[PDB]
Amino acid sequence: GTRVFKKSSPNCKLTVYLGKRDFVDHLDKVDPVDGVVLVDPDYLKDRKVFVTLTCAFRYGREDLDVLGLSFRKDLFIANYQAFPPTPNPPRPPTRLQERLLRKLGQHAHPFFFTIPQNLPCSVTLQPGPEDTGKACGVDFEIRAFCAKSLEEKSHKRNSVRLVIRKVQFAPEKPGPQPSAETTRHFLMSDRSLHLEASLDKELYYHGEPLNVNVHVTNNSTKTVKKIKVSVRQYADICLFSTAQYKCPVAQVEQDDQVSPSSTFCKVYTITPLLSNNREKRGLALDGKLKHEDTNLASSTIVKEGANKEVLGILVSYRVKVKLVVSRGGDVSVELPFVLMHPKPHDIVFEDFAR
């Protein structure tokens, strides 16, 4: 029937419940965080129970893990008092939040957070060989613990740490096909090898294929040995260690040759999937690599209202159409496109940690 997510403190005393692991950014706004929390025996009566929602840029290891953490920027923190409750604010507990409130104790209390759109989206990198940089990325952590006030905490033992995803969704806007790409190469004379390509649309979702349309007008004297069609990711760190991963995440090729004084045309179907990549290399994900539900990081959006450095990493995509050339020298074009997170997509407790 219905599915709900739980993680409980190491001591098992405190537990958190939630309807969504992933929260969508709609540009316009963001799914809300509507959860509940359960601290059974008396903790501490004198001691209040809190919930924290933090969003930070980390560089050096992952996981806001102290050891190796070279740099960290807070981008947003929220608290508010679960128990006791508080006059605040839009308290109307989602239907789910209600059914949950009676399935459990009288000491299950609601809790909610509302997250600004302008914030970056969950994203994660970890360099290859290496590429000298350390790992980094943006995180959305939810902490939940007790203590008499906020300026006193406790190592995880009596708290609960868990991390949510903010995935970026965006609508298919009408408009021109990913600007075709034109280009002429004169290789030694006045006779041109002309290349021309296009995409069916400007925006794609995770899974969606793309249909690269390619037209070659080869009046040249050389020969096109092959035609390699790929998708490249471009990820630029904007905090602390400026750096720039470029990397193909999909790659198609056939036995396609084009003769001098010929003409050739064809449509390639290409699909960019994190799942089709063995080596992460310096790739930009939307969550931990090990997790099945992880995808290539979504294009980062034109940027709403906060802007700047403060997006941490800066993911972006391109199709590349390249013509390998016999007597040498290779002709190409690049078509930029945006890749968003899909959304044309009896309570049962399922373990939160993926």
Task: Give structural attributes.
monomer, 354 residues, mainly beta, Immunoglobulin-like, eight-stranded mixed beta sheet, five-stranded mixed beta sheet, 1 helix, elongated
**What is the terminal-to-terminal distance?**
20 Å
Any idea what the CATH architecture of the largest domain is? Sandwich
Large-scale geometry? elongated
Strand content: over 45%
**Main sheet overview:** 8 strands, mixed
- For the record, the CATH class of the largest domain is Mainly Beta
Number of helices: 1
Radius of gyration: 25 Å
**CATH fold title of the largest domain:** Immunoglobulin-like
Number of domains: 2
N to C succession of SSEs: EEEEEEEHEEEEEEEEEEEEEEE
Summarize the amount of helix as a percent range. Answer: under 10%
Total number of strands = 22
- What structural category arises from helix and sheet content? mainly beta
Motif ([DE]-X(1,2)-F-X-X-[FL]-X-X-X-R motif): 346-354
Protein name: Beta-arrestin-2
Modified residues (Phosphotyrosine): 43
Keywords: Cell membrane, Coated pit, Cytoplasm, Cytoplasmic vesicle, Hydroxylation, Membrane, Nucleus, Phosphoprotein, Protein transport, Signal transduction inhibitor, Transport, Ubl conjugation
